[PDB]
Design a protein around this ligand. Structure first.
Ligand SMILES: Cc1cccc(Nc2nc(Nc3ccc(CC(=O)O)cc3)ncc2C(N)=O)c1
Lengths: 6, 300
């Protein structure tokens, strides 16, 4: 539950 | 790497089993040998990373140990020594008999295959947790740090069912900066971060404060998944749009009131962890005052 993104 | 005063001899360390995989490392349970004043055998937790892992990760690790060398607070798991000598690097720390808070919470559902034979936490019990957790987050901002990842799983339960902040993988230093305008390209916990950081990457005390209400939500919902049913892209849009988490049924009213105060769309409106402890000092455990931080002299 640490989804990659910006 | 580079050996410190915290250095420890690898020979004294024996690893028993795998406790779990975390934000980026590996956590084993082991027994240290003559590391504390008194006992010669003091089972501990050993976090390690692969010397065959991404340099960014490896660095994230170095950082975690680094910021632990300070942090002397009842409500913060204690760093216990490092083992930089050779391979592989080993960070030891005080084992928390009852694992993470998340896992511990679930184990209390009446159903629960692993239920320890006691009822879900009384309202008295919740306040206590909330307080030590908050106390600890206060101690954090005090030494000028943002945790950036406050959530049940990163909270450990000691044997006396005391709660302490664990896992500092995202924790950052803040004189000067007092941010990140983020940076991009990294694993993030959307279900727990405030709306600002979701757009304008940032993270602040008020930000962890948002994360803090979610831990209460977690506590109350008995570790239901925050924003269940939704995808990470959906929740992303939502909490940014102006939404917030719901409210567990049969959930007490004092807590609900806290959650709300942590969810103002405006950070300048979130209370400070100290301000949170204050609202709860008159209902805690007679012991809290002495091990505290809210009472610690350091609270200048
Ligand atoms: C008994 C027990 C059982 C499980 C975890 C821990 N303890 C610790 N665990 C972590 N990370 C950690 C946090 C959550 C998980 C659960 C999962 O698998 O998702 C695993 C490891 N960090 C420090 C300690 C500690 N220093 O006690 C202790």
């Amino acid at each position: 539950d640490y989804m990659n993104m910006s | 790497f580079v050996p410190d005063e915290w250095e420890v001899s690898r020979e004294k360390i024996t690893l028993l089993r795998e406790l779990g995989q975390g934000s980026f490392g590996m956590v084993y349970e082991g027994n240290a040998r003559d590391i504390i004043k008194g006992e010669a055998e003091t089972r501990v937790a050993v976090k390690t990373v692969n010397e065959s892992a991404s340099l960014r990760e490896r660095i994230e690790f170095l950082n975690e140990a680094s910021v632990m060398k300070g942090f002397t607070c009842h409500h913060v798991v204690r760093l216990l020594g490092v083992v930089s000598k050779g391979q592989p690097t080993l960070v030891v720390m005080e084992l928390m008999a009852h694992g993470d808070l998340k896992s511990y919470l679930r184990s209390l559902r009446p159903e629960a295959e692993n239920n320890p034979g006691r009822p879900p936490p009384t309202l008295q019990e919740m306040i206590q947790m909330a307080a030590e957790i908050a106390d600890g987050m206060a101690y954090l901002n005090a030494k000028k740090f943002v945790h950036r990842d406050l959530a049940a799983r990163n909270c450990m339960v000691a044997h006396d069912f005391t709660v302490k902040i664990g896992d500092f993988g995202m924790t950052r230093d803040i004189y000067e900066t007092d941010y990140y305008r983020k940076g991009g390209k990294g694993l993030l916990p959307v279900r727990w971060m405030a709306p600002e950081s979701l757009k304008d990457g940032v993270f602040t005390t008020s930000s962890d404060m948002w994360s803090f209400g979610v831990v209460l939500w977690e506590i109350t919902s008995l570790a239901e998944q925050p924003y269940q049913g939704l995808s990470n892209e959906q929740v992303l849009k939502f909490v940014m749009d102006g939404g917030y988490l719901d409210q567990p049924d049969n959930c007490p009213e004092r807590v609900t009131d806290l959650m709300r105060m942590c969810w103002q769309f405006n950070p300048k409106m979130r209370p400070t962890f100290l301000e949170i402890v204050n609202l709860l000092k008159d209902d805690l455990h007679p012991s809290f005052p002495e091990v505290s931080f809210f009472h610690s002299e350091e609270n200048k």
